[PDB]
Design a protein around this ligand. Structure first.
Ligand SMILES: [Ca+2]
Ligand SMILES: [Cl-]
Ligand SMILES: [Cl-]
Ligand SMILES: [Fe+3]
Ligand SMILES: [Fe+3]
Ligand SMILES: [Fe+3]
Ligand SMILES: [Fe+3]
Lengths: 199, 200
C-alpha cells in the first residue's frame, strides 16, 4: 500500500542539519544539482545492468528524463542567483546505503530498488523540512520538487514488489531503514543534501 | 561555417552490403539501435560527470541526454507495437574503435572526444538516410525523424569542439578520426550492428 513518508523513514531531518543548510545554501544548491544528475545516472546504470527488464527500463528511462529536467532547473536557479559551478564531491549517503545490497540476483535488484525508495523518501522529507525557512522562490521550487520525490519513492518501492516477494522486501526495508537513520543522525564532516549532522 | 555537410564530413557512404545485411535482420538492427540511443544518453551523462565545471557542455549534454532517452523510449514503443522482444545484444566495435583515437591529455582529450561524437552522429544520420528507401512506411517515418535530430547533434558536437578547441587542431583531429571511421565502416565485420562494418 506504500507507507507515508514519515512512517517509512527512520528519523526526521535533524534541526542541526537545517541550520547548517540555511547557512550554506550555495553548497546545498550545488549538491542538490549533483544529486539530480546522480539520480539520472543511477537510473541509466540500472537500465544497462537489467537490459532486458522491460518494466524497469521504461520506468527508468522516463525517471532519468525527469531528473535531468530537475538538474537543468537547479542549474538555471544557480545562474539566476550567481552561484558558481564549484566542484562538490559526493557525500557518504548513497554509497553507504549501496553497501547493504545483497550480491546475488534477484534480491540484488530488489535491494537496489529499496535503496532508491529510501533516497527519494528522504529527499521528500528533507525538502519539506526546508521549505518554511527558505526565501519565497526557492521554497516554492522545493515544494514543487517535494511532490515528484513522493511519486519517485512510490515508484521504486512498487518496482521492488514487481520483482520480489513481500516477506523479502519487508526484511530489506527494515535493514536499510536502520542504516539510513544512522547516516542521517550521525555526525558528518560536511554539508550535503543527504549529509549527517555537522560537528 | 566549417560545419560541413554530413556527406562531406564523412569519409565514405554506407556500403550496399551493409544495407543488405541490415534489411535481412531488422530485429537485431532495432535492438542495437535502441541500445545506441541509450548509450548516447549515458555517454552525455559521462561527459557531464567528467567535465563537471564546463558549463556550456553540461547545459548541452543534459538536454541531449533527455532527447536521446526520448528516442530510446520511442524505439521501445515501436518494438512493442511490432512484437520485437528484448534480448542481449553486446556492443559492437565502432565507438570503442573511435575512442581509441582520443589523445590522452587535456584539453585535446575533450576536443577529440567531441569530434568522435560528431562522427558517430553524422554516421547515424547518413545511415538512417541510406536505410529509409528500403523500409516500411512506419519505420521509415520514424527513422527520418531521427535522421534530422542526428544532423542537429552532429552540429552540436562539432560546435562544442570548436568552443573548447583551436581550429587548426580540430581540423587534423577530424582528418585522423575520419580515416579510422571509414575503415571501421568499410572493413569486414563478424556481426550486424547499427554501426558495424560489412558483415560476413
Ligand atoms: Ca518515522
Ligand atoms: Cl542558520
Ligand atoms: Cl524530457
Ligand atoms: Fe529529482
Ligand atoms: Fe527524484
Ligand atoms: Fe538519437
Ligand atoms: Fe543523436
Amino acid at each position: 500500500l506504500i507507507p507515508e513518508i514519515d512512517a517509512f523513514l527512520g528519523c526526521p531531518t535533524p534541526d542541526a542539519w537545517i541550520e547548517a543548510a540555511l547557512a550554506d545554501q550555495e553548497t546545498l544548491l550545488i549538491d542538490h544539482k549533483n544529486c539530480e544528475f546522480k539520480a539520472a545516472s543511477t537510473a541509466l546504470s540500472l537500465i544497462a545492468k537489467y537490459n532486458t527488464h522491460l518494466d524497469l527500463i521504461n520506468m527508468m528511462s522516463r525517471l532519468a528524463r525527469e531528473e535531468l529536467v530537475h538538474h537543468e532547473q537547479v542549474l538555471r536557479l544557480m545562474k539566476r542567483r550567481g552561484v558558481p559551478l564549484r566542484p562538490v564531491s559526493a557525500g557518504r549517503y548513497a554509497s553507504g546505503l549501496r553497501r547493504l545490497v545483497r550480491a546475488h540476483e534477484p534480491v540484488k535488484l530488489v535491494d537496489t530498488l529499496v535503496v532508491g525508495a529510501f533516497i527519494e523518501a528522504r529527499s521528500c522529507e528533507r525538502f519539506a523540512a526546508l521549505v518554511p525557512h527558505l526565501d519565497e522562490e526557492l521554497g516554492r521550487f522545493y515544494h514543487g520538487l517535494l511532490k515528484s520525490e513522493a511519486r519517485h519513492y512510490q515508484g521504486y518501492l512498487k518496482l521492488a514488489h514487481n520483482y520480489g516477494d513481500e516477506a523479502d522486501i519487508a526484511r530489506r526495508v527494515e535493514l536499510v531503514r536502520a542504516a539510513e537513520m544512522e547516516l542521517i543522525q550521525s555526525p558528518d564532516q560536511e554539508l550535503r543534501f543527504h549529509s549527517g549532522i555537522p560537528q
